[PDB]
């Protein structure tokens, strides 16, 4: 996250850090708790990941330094990638991780509400992007979870900023016309959370952009409302 600040412990209880074990243990991508055995993340985070066996999900983490070999985590039983996914820039940058065990909800770890089918009409004014990603271009994974308040922008306005690309309605953009605040490398899969009627909702999933936090280049997110049926299909399967 560029131009944001250190989070407070327990501020984003749905935020997870998705780690890989092979080659070495490290943070791979963000994610969100959406069910007691479900993580909503981005499909591009699995490029080259040949097995769910090398994955570890950590919830209730503020600092990456909290994670050692003795730290409790959730194993990944199944990686569910949208079957229309080709690449981040073309859309369908969404995936579901079925966890091996149940997440027991606490004040440190609980789920974020998915948007409503009637919430297509709503205008969100308080949207925040969070993650352990880069705060600058050539950087490293951050220790402390970072946060930034970013305004949502219309599809038409986002299309004007992305000549040569096709901003689909399954995409949602957020950014300041002068830049300065955005998600960056390492933040993918993580949430774009909007508070509406004192209720937080998972509006977006960090996906792509042109560099990070540049002027007239708002970050592109997976538009969660447009995937509620797909999510229910995968999670509520008989
Ligand atoms: C386009 C892109 C970008 C372009 C130019 C400069 C900086 C970033 C890169 C894209 C991407 C694609 C494939 C892999 C990675 C990746 C690699 C390593 C690790 C790791 N943990 O070591 C994590 C990740 C991860 O998936 O973040 C990232 N993700 C993204 C998301 C949001 C914004 C944005 N500005 N809103 C920009 C970007």
Extended beta strands in the chain, E state:
5-6, 15-20, 26-35, 38-41, 55-58, 74-81, 95-99, 126-131, 146-149, 152-153, 171-174, 191-196, 199-208, 219-223
Looking at the chain, list the stretches that DSSP marks H as alpha helix, in order from N- to C-terminal side.
155-161, 228-235
Cβ contact 56:19 at 8 Å? yes
Taking CA atoms only, the protein residue closest to ligand 1 atom 24 is 186
Identify the architecture of domain 1-12+112-226 in CATH. Beta Barrel (2.40)
Cα dihedral 213→214→215→219 (10° resolution): -50
CA distance 144 to 191: 16
Secondary structure (3-state) at 188: coil
Instruction: Confirm or reject: Cβ of 43 under 6 Å from ligand 1.
Output: no
CA distance 35 to 57: 14
CA distance 125 to 231: 25
Cβ contact 148:181 at 8 Å? yes
Cβ contact 184:213 at 8 Å? yes
Cβ contact 161:216 at 8 Å? yes
* Residue 160 annotated as binding site: yes
Instruction: Confirm or reject: Cβ of 135 under 6 Å from ligand 1.
Output: no
CA distance 35 to 235: 9
Q: How many angstroms separate the alpha carbon of residue 238 from the centre of ligand 1?
A: 35
Q: Which residue has the tokens 């079957």?
A: 83
Residues in the chain, total: 238
Cβ contact 85:43 at 8 Å? yes
Residues 6+ apart with CB under 8 A from 4: 129, 135, 146, 147, 148, 181
CA distance 48 to 123: 37
Q: Which residues pair with 60 in a beta bridge?
A: none
The CA radius of gyration of the chain, in Å to the nearest whole number, is 16
Supply φ then ψ for residue 219, to 5 degrees. Answer: -65, 145
* Distances from the Cα of 134 to the Cα of 103, 121, 164, 169, 218, angstroms: 28, 33, 26, 27, 16
Q: Which residues pair with 193 in a beta bridge?
A: 128, 202
Domain locations in the chain as residue ranges = 1-12+112-226, 13-111+227-238
Instruction: Confirm or reject: Cβ of 188 under 6 Å from ligand 1.
Output: yes
The two domains 1-12+112-226 and 13-111+227-238 share their CATH topology (first three levels equal):
yes
Instruction: Confirm or reject: Cβ of 174 under 6 Å from ligand 1.
Output: no
Cβ contact 196:120 at 8 Å? no
Q: How many angstroms separate the alpha carbon of residue 46 from the centre of ligand 1?
A: 12
Cβ contact 192:200 at 8 Å? no
Instruction: Confirm or reject: Cβ of 208 under 6 Å from ligand 1.
Output: yes
Residues 6+ apart with CB under 8 A from 210: 162, 217
CA distance 41 to 38: 10
Q: Which residues pair with 200 in a beta bridge?
A: 195
Identify the architecture of domain 13-111+227-238 in CATH. Beta Barrel (2.40)
Q: How many angstroms separate the alpha carbon of residue 193 from the centre of ligand 1?
A: 19
Cβ contact 211:141 at 8 Å? no
DSSP string covering 21-52, please? -SSS-EEEEEEEEEETTEEEE-GGGGTT---G
Taking CA atoms only, the protein residue closest to ligand 1 atom 30 is 208
Among 94, 83, 22, 96, residue whose Cα is nearest residue 53: 22
């Amino acid at each position: 996250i560029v131009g944001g600040t250190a989070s407070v412990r327990g501020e984003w209880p749905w935020q997870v850090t998705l780690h890989t074990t092979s080659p070495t243990q490290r943070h791979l991508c963000g994610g969100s708790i959406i069910g007691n055995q479900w993580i909503l993340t981005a499909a591009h985070c699995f490029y080259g990941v040949e097995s769910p066996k090398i994955l570890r999900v950590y919830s209730g983490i503020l600092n990456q330094s909290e994670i050692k070999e003795d730290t409790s985590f959730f194993g990944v039983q199944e990686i569910i990638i949208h079957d229309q996914y080709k690449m981040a820039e073309s859309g369908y940058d969404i995936a579901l991780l079925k966890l091996e065990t149940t997440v027991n909800y606490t004040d440190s770890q609980r789920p974020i509400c998915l948007p409503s089918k009637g919430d297509r009409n709503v205008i969100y004014t308080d949207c925040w992007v969070t993650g352990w990603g880069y705060r600058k271009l050539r950087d490293k994974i951050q220790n402390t979870l970072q946060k930034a308040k970013i305004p949502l922008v219309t599809n038409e306005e986002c299309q004007k900023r992305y000549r040569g690309h096709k901003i689909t309605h399954k995409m949602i953009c957020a950014g300041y016309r002068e830049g300065g605040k955005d998600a960056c490398k390492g933040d993918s899969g993580g949430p774009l959370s909007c508070k509406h009627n004192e209720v937080w909702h998972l509006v977006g999933i960090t996906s792509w952009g042109e560099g990070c936090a540049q002027r007239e280049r708002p970050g592109v997110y997976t538009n969660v409302v447009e995937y509620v049926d797909w999510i229910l299909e995968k999670t509520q399967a008989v």
